[PDB]
Amino acid sequence: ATLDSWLSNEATVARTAILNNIGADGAWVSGADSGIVVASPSTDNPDYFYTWTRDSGLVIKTLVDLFRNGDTDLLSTIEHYISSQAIIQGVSNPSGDLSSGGLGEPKFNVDETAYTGSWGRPQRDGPALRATAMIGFGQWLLDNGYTSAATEIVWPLVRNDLSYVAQYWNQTGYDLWEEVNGSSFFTIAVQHRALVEGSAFATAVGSSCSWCDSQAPQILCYLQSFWTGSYILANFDSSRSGKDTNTLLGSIHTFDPEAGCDDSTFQPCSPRALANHKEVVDSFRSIYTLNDGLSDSEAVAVGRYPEDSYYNGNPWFLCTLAAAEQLYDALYQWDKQGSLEITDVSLDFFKALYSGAATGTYSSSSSTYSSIVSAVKTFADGFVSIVETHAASNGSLSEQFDKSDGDELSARDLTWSYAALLTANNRRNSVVPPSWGETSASSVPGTCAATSASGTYSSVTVTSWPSIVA
């Protein structure tokens, strides 16, 4: 009633607010070059008036999925993005140059110049997210007969990013929250995905990605160590508990609708991902006043990690939305498989929502199934309701909402907040992204090796774009 209605409305605001934060015509970010996704129009306290490789990557992947589903008007946005990245790849910055680490730089000025101050650099997820975003578009181009655009523009750009991933996966760097210098789940996860899809894309254009093939399996091997037996460790080399929404994002951004509940890939329905979901959400239940009085079968306001002090440590729109997207993903998966399984690892997740939960396999026509899925759906919607309750009356989504009063704080009109809304809504509606080949990339090697593979670097020049019609 309320929710379905607010969601449809919000999806429209979310799409518009995103376009507003992209240069060089975006109404809120005058100054940004063409195809430059700005984190937020906020230039002071905090200053988010910059472009991050991760942020743009996530946003554009969302735009490509909408485009592929019929939002044909986004073509020019996507093209401008690709053109801008051809340039960014080549900008010399504190992380290096194209072939010497430059690709790992977290952010840049909106005018495409380097950000020279001190920053937690590099962030190795960047290159992986950008490649994933471009491959999505490249696939479309191949399908609609624009072979040249795909082979000559997209592939070469992707090849650079894939080379960086294969070369440095096994080195520490900063996490997505830009604070912990170590080895992070989200990064490893998204890096594994990029090499797999990168390899298939290379073959599709009549080329190859040898470095994608040898490293993918090794990245997967390494990923297995993040499981502690109870939850997914967010980062190695950290002194925190390790419970972080970082792990929810890694699962949802690597969700493959063709996958079963694979533990090796931390799929949304995997017993390990469900157990983790419970550990992570529960960690915020007693630390936010906003969560006072809700029981364990009720949705709560979710933050990044329980130890967060940023602006005092508050719930985040995107974190709360991720908690719900993982559930929508799992519902979809169970629905396609036609059954759901409860194991000892995931019993606690299930039991908190359906007290008669017991291990076993439940077909989709069973009473237990019916009872579990209704409860999960209601819990997932609960998180979305929290968002809706704290959004501004006109739909504006901020970075955070106050731990005590629910007021919006930190960066205003955060692009990422809007993209997280769009994807949660899509999933809720059974609108899933194209598969990335998880069904042929979930096998763990017998022994993990600390290794790398050196690919190849070459500067791309985007002279012109063919007259593409959608």
Ligand X SMILES: *[C@@H]1O[C@H](CO)[C@@H](O[C@@H]2O[C@H](CO)[C@@H](O[C@@H]3O[C@H](CO)[C@@H](O)[C@H](O[C@H]4O[C@H](CO)[C@@H](O)[C@H](O)[C@@H]4O[C@H]4O[C@H](CO)[C@@H](O)[C@H](O)[C@@H]4O)[C@@H]3O)[C@H](O)[C@H]2NC(C)=O)[C@H](O)[C@H]1NC(C)=O
Ligand Y SMILES: *[C@@H]1O[C@H](CO)[C@@H](O[C@@H]2O[C@H](CO)[C@@H](O[C@@H]3O[C@H](CO[C@H]4O[C@H](CO)[C@@H](O)[C@H](O[C@H]5O[C@H](CO)[C@@H](O)[C@H](O)[C@@H]5O)[C@@H]4O)[C@@H](O)[C@H](O[C@H]4O[C@H](CO)[C@@H](O)[C@H](O)[C@@H]4O[C@H]4O[C@H](CO)[C@@H](O)[C@H](O)[C@@H]4O[C@H]4O[C@H](CO)[C@@H](O)[C@H](O)[C@@H]4O)[C@@H]3O)[C@H](O)[C@H]2NC(C)=O)[C@H](O)[C@H]1NC(C)=O
Please count the residues of this chain forming the interface with ligand X, following the rule CB under 6 A. 15
Q: What angle in degrees, to the nearest 10, is found between the helix axes of 125-143 and 75-90?
A: 140
Q: Is the separation of the CB atoms in 272 and 266 below 8 Å?
A: yes
304 Cβ contact partners less than 8 Å away, ≥ 6 residues apart: 177, 244, 245, 246, 310, 313, 316, 319
What is the closest distance, in whole angstroms, from the C-beta atom of residue 181 to ligand MAN in the complex? 19
Told to check if 23 binds ligand Y by CB under 6 A, we report: no
Using rule CB under 6 A, residue 422 touches ligand Y: no
Compose the 32-71 pattern: x for residues touching ligand X by CB under 6 A, - for all others: ----------------------------------------
Q: Which does 460 bind (CB under 5 to 8 A by kind): ligand X, ligand MAN, ligand Y, none?
A: ligand MAN
Binding flag, residue 344, ligand Y (CB under 6 A): no
343 is a contact residue toward ligand X (CB under 6 A): no
Q: 412 is in the binding site of which of ligand MAN, ligand Y, ligand X, none (Cβ under 5 to 8 A by kind)? A: ligand Y
In the chain the first and final C-alpha atoms are separated, in Å, by 35
b vs e for 427-439, b when ≥16 Cβ sit within 10 Å of the residue's Cβ?
bbeebbbbebbbe
List the beta bridge partners of residue 24.
none
411 SS3 class: coil
Which segments of 238-366 does DSSP mark as H helices, in order?
A: 246-252, 271-282, 317-337, 347-351
Residue 236 touching ligand X (CB under 6 A):
yes
Q: Which of 409, 462 has the CB closer to ligand Y?
A: 409
Task: For helices 53-68 and 415-428, give the axis angle rounded to 10 degrees.
Answer: 40
* 178 catalytic residue (yes or no): yes
> How many Å is the Cα radius of gyration of the chain?
21
406 binds, among ligand X, ligand Y, ligand MAN, none (CB under 5 to 8 A by kind): none
Catalytic residue from among 178, 179, 335, 341 = 178
Q: Would you mind telling me the total number of residues written for the chain in this entry?
A: 470
266 part of the interface to ligand X, by CB under 6 A: no
Contact 125, 180 (CB under 8 A): no
User: Which partner, ligand X, ligand MAN, ligand Y, none, binds residue 440 by CB below 5 to 8 Å per kind?
Assistant: ligand MAN
Q: How far is the CB of 409 from ligand Y (least distance, A)?
A: 6
User: What whole-number distance in Å separates Cα of residue 222 and Cα of residue 217?
Assistant: 9
> 294 or 448: whose CB is closer to ligand X?
448
Binding of ligand X by 450 (CB under 6 A):
yes
170 belongs to the binding site for ligand X (CB under 6 A): yes
114 binds, among ligand X, ligand MAN, ligand Y, none (CB under 5 to 8 A by kind): none
- Of ligand Y, ligand X, ligand MAN, none, which one does residue 26 interact with (CB within 5 to 8 Å by kind)? none
Nearest-5° Cα angle at 141, 210 to 199: 15
Pairing relation of β-strands 235-236 and 107-108?
Answer: unpaired
User: Under the phi-then-psi rule, with left for phi > 0, alpha for psi from -120 to 50, and beta for the rest, what region is 86?
Assistant: alpha
For the record, the structure tokens of 451 come out as 């290794």
Q: Note whether 225 binds ligand X by CB under 6 A.
A: yes
Residues with catalytic roles: 175, 178
Binding site for ligand X (CB under 6 A): 170-172, 183, 221-222, 225, 228, 233, 236-238, 242, 448, 450
Binding site for ligand Y (CB under 6 A): 13, 17, 29-31, 41-45, 49, 392, 394-396, 408-413
